[PDB]
RNA sequence: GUGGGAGAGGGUGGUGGAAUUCCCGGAGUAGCGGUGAAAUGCGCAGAUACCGGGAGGAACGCCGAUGGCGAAGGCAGCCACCUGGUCCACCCGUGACGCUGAGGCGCGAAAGCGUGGGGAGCAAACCGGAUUAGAUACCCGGGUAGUCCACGCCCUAAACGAUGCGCGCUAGGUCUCUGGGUCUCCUGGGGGCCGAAGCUAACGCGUUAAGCGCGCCGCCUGGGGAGUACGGCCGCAAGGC
């Protein structure tokens, strides 16, 4: 019971999961979903409509707290990433902006045996 | 039908009421080529349309065929060495012939006596939403949309 | 194929050796970070070459920056 | 010699940002992870995702390329100090001082060895989970050596242009790197492609020769046995010659 009415809805997708984080505009959470949260199970998970049914569940989450407008922060390239953001873009929830900001290092460690050449 | 595009057969309209929907009908119902059998079902069913509901059946057969069309179906794939259940949509010519096949695989599993009995009382059933063609449409569109995880390998 | 607009023909007299000059080393930037190549500067190999390295210089003092956030996606 | 150029050439010190992991705090809930599908694994001692702080090891995204440097191996964030090679213009000086090079000596990717540090990520071995007919594997979860540092060893390779070094001669066209100049163009060094003559068994090479010539070194002599045995020299050992 906060009303916080204004945030930050991050979105963690991957080739495995997709996965909504909604914040205040500290970045602190208030709710959150995923694919899990929902009933899939296995790969099922990585799906573009179990993306768009985790992120649903979390603007329905976030109405709870009464938030109307989000910023939306997408990390990770994968599978139900643009049908999350298409999923908040008429969730209910406005989204004044749109930003990826996913992690590249310069360089810095060494990938595993699957992600190497 | 790898080379053309293998247009359709048009059929001749109906002896009776002028309608093709009606003539491709009564051919779903023949049999081992009897034309006259399967035309004497269907008027003969015709006529128990009416003294049972006041009403021309021309219009409870078009509206059960209504009732009876599928929007989605699930057809299968082989995806990444698994078989998946994949939805799609119907095109209005296959929820044609779905319906219509689905009317007499219906009228023939019931516990009517004779044929045309079956059905009218299968056309007149499915009219108003219910009967075994309506749950063919209500269980396929129900195996569509369940798999709706698979959407996206349409094609 | 970079026919919108080359850099150095949107530029006039500068000096590419300037480090602290960030009103001018910002045009070379992209909307990330990222030090853009040939096609949009438009400059030489050794002209590529030095401004290349006053703009890491640039990075290290805090006048440019390494990276950013791409808007809009 | 003089005066200019270009460069990830080398050593030492310093230093910058991104990411991973871990630790701390905040907020927050039922999962995360992973696959073809799974499972192991992790999570109610509160994980995953998210914000703030902090530690540490390694590697330097874009620039970056068909680019550059180096004798080879090889060299890539930035700053400074020390230091090697090279290129051009000027025609200044020495006066054949040249070339090659058995032995020698020095260098020499990775892996590997000794001591001591370090250890984030990755990971032989190994421990699990799968798959399979089996699966001492490919796939997934872990993980030791190692990968990193100083010092000392080791001396191998598809160490490759599978093409020893130097010098002269023999059509051009074109792309590029870096000089000089009367800067449409001329001229020098380097890297590419196509091709004259020519050569080659062919493939192809062709002013960056595999063409035409001279100098000197190294090497081959049918396949297996065999890079084995023996001897010797080297090495801490693995092993090398
Ligand atoms: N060598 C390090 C590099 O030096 C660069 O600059 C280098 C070159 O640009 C510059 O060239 C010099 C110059 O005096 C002029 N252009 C001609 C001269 N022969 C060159 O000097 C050259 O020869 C001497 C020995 O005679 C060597 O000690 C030196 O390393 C070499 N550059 O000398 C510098 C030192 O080599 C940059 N600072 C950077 O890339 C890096 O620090
Ligand atoms: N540090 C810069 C470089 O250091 C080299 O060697 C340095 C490093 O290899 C060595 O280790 C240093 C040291 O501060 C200490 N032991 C730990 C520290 N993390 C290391 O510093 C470095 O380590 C690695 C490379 O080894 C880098 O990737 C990393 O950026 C940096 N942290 O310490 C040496 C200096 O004391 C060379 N001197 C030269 O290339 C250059 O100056
Ligand atoms: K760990
Ligand atoms: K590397
Ligand atoms: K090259
Ligand atoms: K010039
Ligand atoms: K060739
Ligand atoms: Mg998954
Ligand atoms: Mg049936
Ligand atoms: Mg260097
Ligand atoms: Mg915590
Ligand atoms: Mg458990
Ligand atoms: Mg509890
Ligand atoms: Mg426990
Ligand atoms: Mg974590
Ligand atoms: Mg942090
Ligand atoms: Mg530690
Ligand atoms: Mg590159
Ligand atoms: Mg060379
Ligand atoms: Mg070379
Ligand atoms: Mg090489
Ligand atoms: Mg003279
Ligand atoms: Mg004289
Ligand atoms: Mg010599
Ligand atoms: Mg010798
Ligand atoms: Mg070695
Ligand atoms: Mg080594
Ligand atoms: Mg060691
Ligand atoms: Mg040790
Ligand atoms: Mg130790
Ligand atoms: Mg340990
Ligand atoms: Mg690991
Ligand atoms: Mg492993
Ligand atoms: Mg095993
Ligand atoms: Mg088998
Ligand atoms: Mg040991
Ligand atoms: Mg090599
Ligand atoms: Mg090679
Ligand atoms: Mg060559
Ligand atoms: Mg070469
Ligand atoms: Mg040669
Ligand atoms: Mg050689
Ligand atoms: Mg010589
Ligand atoms: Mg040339
Ligand atoms: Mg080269
Ligand atoms: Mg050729
Ligand atoms: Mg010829
Ligand atoms: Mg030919
Ligand atoms: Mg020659
Ligand atoms: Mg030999
Ligand atoms: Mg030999
Ligand atoms: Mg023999
Ligand atoms: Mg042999
Ligand atoms: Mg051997
Ligand atoms: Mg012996
Ligand atoms: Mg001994
Ligand atoms: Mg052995
Ligand atoms: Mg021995």
Redesign the interface.
Known sequence: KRQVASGRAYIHASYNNTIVTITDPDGNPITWSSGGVIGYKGSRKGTPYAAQLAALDAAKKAMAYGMQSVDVIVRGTGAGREQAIRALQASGLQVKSIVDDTPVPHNGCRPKKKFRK | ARRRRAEVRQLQPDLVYGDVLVTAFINKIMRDGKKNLAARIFYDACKIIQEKTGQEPLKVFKQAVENVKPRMEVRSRRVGGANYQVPMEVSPRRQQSLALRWLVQAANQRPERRAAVRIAHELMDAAEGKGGAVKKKEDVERMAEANRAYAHYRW | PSRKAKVKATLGEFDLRDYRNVEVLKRFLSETGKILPRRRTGLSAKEQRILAKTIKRARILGLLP??E?????
Do not use: G, I
Request: net charge positive; hydrophobic share 45%; no cysteine.
């Open positions: 390494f990276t956030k791409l808007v809009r996606k």
